[PDB]
Amino acid sequence: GAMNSSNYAELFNNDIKLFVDDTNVYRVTVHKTFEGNVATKAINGCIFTLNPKTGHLFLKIIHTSVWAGQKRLSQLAKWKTAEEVSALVRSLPKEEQPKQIIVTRKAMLDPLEVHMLDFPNIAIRPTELRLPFSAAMSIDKLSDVVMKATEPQMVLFNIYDDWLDRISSYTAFSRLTLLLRALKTNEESAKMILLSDPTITIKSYHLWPSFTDEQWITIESQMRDLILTEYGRKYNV
Amino acid sequence: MNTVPFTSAPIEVTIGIDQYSFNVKENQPFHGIKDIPIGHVHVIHFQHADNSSMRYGYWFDCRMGNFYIQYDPKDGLYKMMEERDGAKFENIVHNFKERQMMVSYPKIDEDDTWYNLTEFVQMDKIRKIVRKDENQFSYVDSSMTTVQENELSDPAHSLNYTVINFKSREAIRPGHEMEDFLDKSYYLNTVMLQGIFKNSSNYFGELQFAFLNAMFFGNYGSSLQWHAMIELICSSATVPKHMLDKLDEILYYQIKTLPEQYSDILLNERVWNICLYSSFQKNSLHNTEKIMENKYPELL
Numbered sequence A: 001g002a003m004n005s006s007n008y009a010e011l012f013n014n015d016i017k018l019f020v021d022d023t024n025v026y027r028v029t030v031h032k033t034f035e036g037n038v039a040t041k042a043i044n045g046c047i048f049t050l051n052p053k054t055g056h057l058f059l060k061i062i063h064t065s066v067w068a069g070q071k072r073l074s075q076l077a078k079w080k081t082a083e084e085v086s087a088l089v090r091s092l093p094k095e096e097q098p099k100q101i102i103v104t105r106k107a108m109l110d111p112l113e114v115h116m117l118d119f120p121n122i123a124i125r126p127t128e129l130r131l132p133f134s135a136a137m138s139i140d141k142l143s144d145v146v147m148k149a150t151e152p153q154m155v156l157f158n159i160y161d162d163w164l165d166r167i168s169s170y171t172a173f174s175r176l177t178l179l180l181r182a183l184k185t186n187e188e189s190a191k192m193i194l195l196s197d198p199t200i201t202i203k204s205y206h207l208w209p210s211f212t213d214e215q216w217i218t219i220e221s222q223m224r225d226l227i228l229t230e231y232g233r234k235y236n237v
Numbered sequence B: 001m002n003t004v005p006f007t008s009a010p011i012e013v014t015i016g017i018d019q020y021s022f023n024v025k026e027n028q029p030f031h032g033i034k035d036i037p038i039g040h041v042h043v044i045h046f047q048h049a050d051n052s053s054m055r056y057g058y059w060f061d062c063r064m065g066n067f068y069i070q071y072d073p074k075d076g077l078y079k080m081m082e083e084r085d086g087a088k089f090e091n092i093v094h095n096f097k098e099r100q101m102m103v104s105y106p107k108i109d110e111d112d113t114w115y116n117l118t119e120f121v122q123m124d125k126i127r128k129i130v131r132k133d134e135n136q137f138s139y140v141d142s143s144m145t146t147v148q149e150n151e152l153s154d155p156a157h158s159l160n161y162t163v164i165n166f167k168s169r170e171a172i173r174p175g176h177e178m179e180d181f182l183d184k185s186y187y188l189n190t191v192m193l194q195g196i197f198k199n200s201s202n203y204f205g206e207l208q209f210a211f212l213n214a215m216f217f218g219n220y221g222s223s224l225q226w227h228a229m230i231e232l233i234c235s236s237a238t239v240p241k242h243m244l245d246k247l248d249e250i251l252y253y254q255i256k257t258l259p260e261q262y263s264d265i266l267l268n269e270r271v272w273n274i275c276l277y278s279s280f281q282k283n284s285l286h287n288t289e290k291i292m293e294n295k296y297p298e299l300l
């Protein structure tokens, strides 16, 4: 069934599961043509496939050559996402394959279900949550590797850096969603919060600054404040 | 013109014969139906006055034997029986016609409705869907489940319709996932028509039989099958032109005959709007689209 706030701790049990977000797969700029009409120009995208228990991110980079000569790209993008997720699952040893794949957008269900017919024991589930994974492309190192790609490419990251050495998966996922929600709602302010102090460094093999436990408390409070301020602005409340 | 004679009518019942129906009172002098047109299958069906639940009936072809109807007070239903003896049957029917104790199959000469609804339906294919080999006629009722329904419980009482499943390996070639899902022509033409049904007349015969079981018995699994077989054609970009014209005719007469007060449960809103307005064949069903728009614009 669908994933929501009632069954949210299920993400951190010992059944291997992956989130798949396809928001950033097909990305275009919209521009005017010489004749004054409108055209799209694609830029590189990515599939965001995340194990929320371990932090492992399988970032499949979608190079613009994928779209060359193809029609109905928004629809093709969902099928390309499903093809690549299935290819990932097939590449994993059986004991590493997920028991569930949770898609962030319901339109991914039929494409994935069809591509996963060979895996009847992998459940494909939607979610009622409004998860902020679209903001993955506001993480500088992720955006950089996507844009610099000259061909299709899979890049692996731990989206939690080393946090799991000190906190649980539940807490790490809450910290990630907070950071991503903030980046989604006001990227500039969110990045200012994270990036205001250049003497707080990011380790070459990390995505986020090396905050001490107490600095994380400060940062998390600042992100909460940002998100609530934006909320009142949106709804004049 | 053949006869389905009744031994009696001990319980009050509404009797259907194809698209017609008559009320018979408890113990009324009722000895069956005459003048049944030869050359088509037929269905004789029953709704007891005291259980508006369970409609049931018998598919038959008078060319295949001498069928009568006798009430069974143990099982509580009107049963079809074949009279081996052509002359016990003949002298009996002879009597009953003489006493004018038979209703006449009330076909209007100008009226092709029953032919139009049963054009591709053959008894031998019915008997493969409804497996009961010791009889030449086939029993169906409101509650019988389909083989497909049973995969998702008594196998002997099942409707063995051909299983159609759009999210199945049968429907989807490896490496053509998107192609075969969004354009079902492979599934229609190669898997189903060439492979399982052999020809389009057999396909249309099962589609027509499924509709009639849905309409006459409220058989839900039959309605599912009728819609699935329509959707498979409409969701195929490549369909023989002869099948498209025939489908339009087939659906037109089904929609024409459907009881207006049943369209809410017999017609699937999603299938019909997809088929008429979104699918590859949205412009190939002109007669069906016109009768649907003038009769059931609410559903669309």
Ligand SMILES: CN1C(=O)c2ccccc2[C@@H]1O
Residues within 6 Å of the ligand: B005, B006, B007, B068, B069, B070, B083, B088, B089, B092, B093
């Ligand atoms: C046993 N019976 C038959 O032999 C028969 C044939 C026609 C009408 C009615 C009947 C009758 O009840």
